[PDB]
Each structure stands twice: as C-alpha cells, then as structure tokens.
C-alpha cells in the first residue's frame, strides 16, 4: 500500500508532538516508547509491533499493539496489569517481548523499565542532613 512504519518514521523523524529536544539529548513523551528515546527502535507509535509500560497503583501495566486492529484505536492496545512478585512480572514481560518474535530487540529495555517502576514504587529512605561547610555558612 501507501502507508508503512518506515513511511511514518520518515514523516515524523524530525518533528512530532511527543518530541522533547534539548541541548543534552532528545527525548520522547510517547507512551509506547521504552527508555523515552527518540529513535526508530523505540518509536512505538511508529512501529507496527510495539510495547509500553506504565506504573499502576502497585506493579506495572503493559500495553502491546495489536497488528490486526491498527485502524481501531479503541481496541488497538492489549493491556495486562502485573501486580505480583517482581520476578514473575519480569518473566511475563520477557515472554511477551521475546517468545513469539514480538520485538525481541526490546526485551532488555522492557524488563529494565518494569524494574525501574517497581524500584520507584518502594518507600524512599530519608536523606542525611546537610553539613554546613566553611566559615560564612558555618558562622
């Protein structure tokens, strides 16, 4: 046909609404973007098969593109909530990222993103108090 993921990448490689460009790097706000980097590898909204992970109240929520529902945005996302042990979450995410050939190149990124979200959901450790240094600050 006239439309492909390669076409969409050439159309939106230089500008899209998800693009966040700064001096130290280019980031993306796309929900189907693992690692939030602007590239063809991680452009989930561009690629036909794509994975995204968002936090839940406890655990992660993983969405994957359905290839047979590309023109139906209400039913284009296959959504699973993992609220269980981190190891089972990693196993299931790696299985749906690698076992059936559905973006096996995104496997490490997906597992790492799930690990980062589960790490952030832990309670934080209170910081040591700041030490006053020198003469004008100390006195």
């Amino acid at each position: 046909s006239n439309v492909s993921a390669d076409l969409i990448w050439e159309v939106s490689r230089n500008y899209n609404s998800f693009l966040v460009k700064q001096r130290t790097g280019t980031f993306s706000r796309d929900a189907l973007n693992l690692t939030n980097q602007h590239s063809r590898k991680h452009a989930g909204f561009v690629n036909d098969k794509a994975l995204g992970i968002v936090p839940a109240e406890k655990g992660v929520k993983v969405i994957a593109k359905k290839v047979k529902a590309a023109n139906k945005p209400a039913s284009s996302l296959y959504t699973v909530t993992y609220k269980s042990t981190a190891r089972k979450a990693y196993k299931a995410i790696a299985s749906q990222a690698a076992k059936h050939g559905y973006r096996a190149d995104l496997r490490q990124a997906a597992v790492a993103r799930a690990s980062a979200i589960l790490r952030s959901q832990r309670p934080v450790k209170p910081e040591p108090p700041k030490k006053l240094r020198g003469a004008a600050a100390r006195r």
Binding site: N2, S17, A70, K72, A74
Partner: protein
C-alpha cells in the same frame, strides 16, 4: 504596499496536497503524532451515520 503578499500555487499541487492530507488523516499514528486525543476513538476514519 506593493510588496508581493499573495502566493500563486498550481491547482494540481493544491489538489495533490489536499489528497496527501486526506490520506494522512486515515493514519491513526499520525493523528496521535499531531497531538490529537484519539485513544477512545472506535475506528479511523471515524464515520458517523447521516441520520444522526
């Protein structure tokens, strides 16, 4: 005031651009890439009954 304010465009190129924009309007990823909130839209292109 006699600066050249208006631009003459070929009608064929105007129609070509309109066709390309209509074709891009049926591509659901480009709708999201242009900032539109279409996650709850049942189908693209969205066709509603003329009786409504």
């Amino acid at each position: 005031i006699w600066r050249k304010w208006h631009v003459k465009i070929n009608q064929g190129q105007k129609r070509f651009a309109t066709a390309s924009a209509l074709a891009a309007s049926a591509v659901a990823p480009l709708l999201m890439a242009r900032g539109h909130q279409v996650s709850t839209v049942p189908e693209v292109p969205l066709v509603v009954d003329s009786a409504a």
